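Work Package 4 report. The design task specified in the project plan requires that, given a folded chain encoded as structure tokens, an amino acid be chosen for each position. We show below one input record used in the internal validation round.
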């Protein structure tokens, strides 16, 4: 069976379509999203990320920033300034050098391969079978090199990447926006852990097109965490006099608490940050209000509107021209974000229902099912049918059908006719092809007579007219006096 994988900058997610529903699969730790992190032993996911504070030089993350790019790419030269691990050119490509005290050099797609191996190892456990096929998502702005590099990361991990799909397109498919009538302008607002992407999608009768894209490559949920961590470190110093910044474990534990507290503030107006051994055996427990969280981050929040205005004016659209707003990324749970977006679109409510950090993985899994042979319902048999309507002329030049259009061949169909006059001694069978009610508007294929009808009043004699089509398309029309056994036939080609 084939799975859907969201391979994100900061977190990755895996889903699958089974028993008429998509299932987002939790990992060994029970988390439905896995950090895109790799760190004597080799660690992948939550374990690797927990090591960052103590061993930054040899903890690899944000490989998606480098994948399928050249060393002299201004984006690469900019990003390597703030990455703690060693990035070196080799044949014009950026390579990551870490200490396993063995030193090793990894291509970005090799780090991504390890992350995909973990997501593959998450789905196999749940399903109880080996996973060999996947639909993998990429940002809409990815070029062929970045798409191929992502394909190669799947191949190294032992997956047949059937399709590579745009992240905004996958989000739209999760909300079933592909299964509506007419044309729709859709904005995708994607605020992830480390990246902000805005995408203007057009859908005209099932067909998706990415009109324009914008955002900020260095804005995400983790920037909101940093602002809160700053606040509580400053406050703890003021409350006590202990500076905590250089205590690896203190910052590690504070980050965990701020992440969970932030998520609670998406549901409630107050959350408690409780650390048990914060610094030198001292406990720390404080309340963070929603109001205080919003105050610390309001300028970051307001900055997400600027790229939204740019995609609109780059695509020659007004706010009014937008039909749907789809929210993607964990950070779009933040009530103030949803409030700002709604305010921006003069009272229009963004689309919600799917957990916004699972939306891309959900949509990937839907397309996965569409290419999955496991979802087999029932088989078809081709029918041989007659493309034309065949019949005979009745009193008044009326078209009486014996073989309707799309009747299956071979066939034998009989209808009973009688005389239109008292002691009528003969019938003329006039064979017609066409759809019109008067035979004058239809095509004559031929005629024959049936003579020697014994005398009787009108409507009393009983004649069976039979139309026979065999395999060759040979039409054979028979008229039989059922009373006597009198017969005549014609064969039309």
């Amino acid at each position: 069976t084939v799975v859907g994988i969201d391979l994100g900058t900061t977190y990755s997610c895996v889903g699958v379509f089974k028993n008429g529903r998509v299932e987002i699969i939790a990992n060994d730790q029970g988390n439905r999203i896995t950090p895109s992190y790799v760190a004597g032993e080799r660690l992948i996911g939550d374990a690797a990320k927990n090591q960052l504070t103590s061993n930054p030089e040899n903890t690899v993350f944000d490989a998606k920033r480098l994948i399928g790019r050249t060393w002299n790419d201004p984006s690469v030269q900019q990003d390597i300034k703030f990455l703690p691990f060693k990035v070196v050119e080799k044949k014009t490509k950026p390579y990551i050098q870490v200490d396993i005290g063995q030193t090793k050099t990894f291509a970005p797609e090799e780090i991504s391969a390890m992350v995909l191996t973990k997501m593959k190892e998450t789905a196999e456990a749940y399903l109880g079978k080996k996973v060999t096929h996947a639909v993998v998502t990429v940002p809409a702005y990815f070029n062929d090199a970045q798409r191929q590099a992502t394909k190669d990361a799947g191949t190294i991990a032992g997956l047949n990447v059937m399709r590579i799909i745009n992240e905004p397109t996958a989000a739209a498919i999760a909300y079933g926006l592909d299964k509506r009538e007419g044309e729709k302008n859709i904005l995708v607002f994607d605020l992830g852990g480390g990246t902000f992407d805005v995408s203007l999608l057009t859908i005209d009768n099932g067909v998706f097109e990415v009109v324009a894209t914008n955002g900020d490559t260095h804005l995400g949920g983790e920037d909101f965490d940093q602002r809160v961590m700053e606040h509580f470190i400053k406050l703890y110093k003021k409350k006590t006099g202990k500076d905590v910044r250089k205590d690896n474990r203190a910052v590690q534990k504070l980050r965990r608490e701020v992440e969970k507290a932030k998520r609670a503030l998406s549901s409630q107006h107050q959350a408690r940050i409780e650390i048990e051994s914060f610094f030198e055996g001292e406990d720390f427990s404080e309340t963070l209000t929603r109001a205080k969280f919003e105050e610390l981050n309001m300028d970051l929040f307001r900055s997400t509107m600027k790229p939204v205005q740019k995609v609109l004016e780059d695509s020659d659209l007004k706010k009014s021209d937008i039909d749907e707003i789809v929210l993607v990324g964990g950070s779009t749970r933040i009530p103030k974000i949803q409030q700002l977006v709604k305010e921006f679109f003069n009272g229009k409510e963004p689309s919600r229902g799917i957990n916004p950090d699972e939306a891309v993985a959900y949509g990937a899994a839907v397309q996965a099912g569409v290419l999955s042979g496991d979802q087999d319902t029932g088989d078809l048999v081709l029918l041989d049918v007659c493309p034309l309507t065949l019949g005979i002329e009745t009193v008044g030049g009326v078209m009486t059908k014996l073989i309707p259009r799309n009747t299956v061949v071979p066939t034998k169909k009989s209808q009973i006719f009688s005389t239109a006059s008292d002691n009528q001694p003969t019938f003329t069978i006039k064979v017609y092809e066409g759809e019109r009610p008067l035979t004058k508007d239809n095509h004559l294929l031929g005629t024959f007579d049936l003579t020697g009808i014994p005398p009787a009043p009108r409507g009393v004699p009983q004649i069976e007219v039979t139309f026979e089509i065999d395999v060759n398309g040979i039409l054979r029309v028979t008229a039989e006096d059922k009373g006597t056994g009198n017969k005549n036939k014609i064969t039309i080609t």
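The domain at 385-492 is CATH 2.60.34.10 (Substrate Binding Domain Of DNAk; Chain A, domain 1). Validation will be extended to a larger panel in the next phase.
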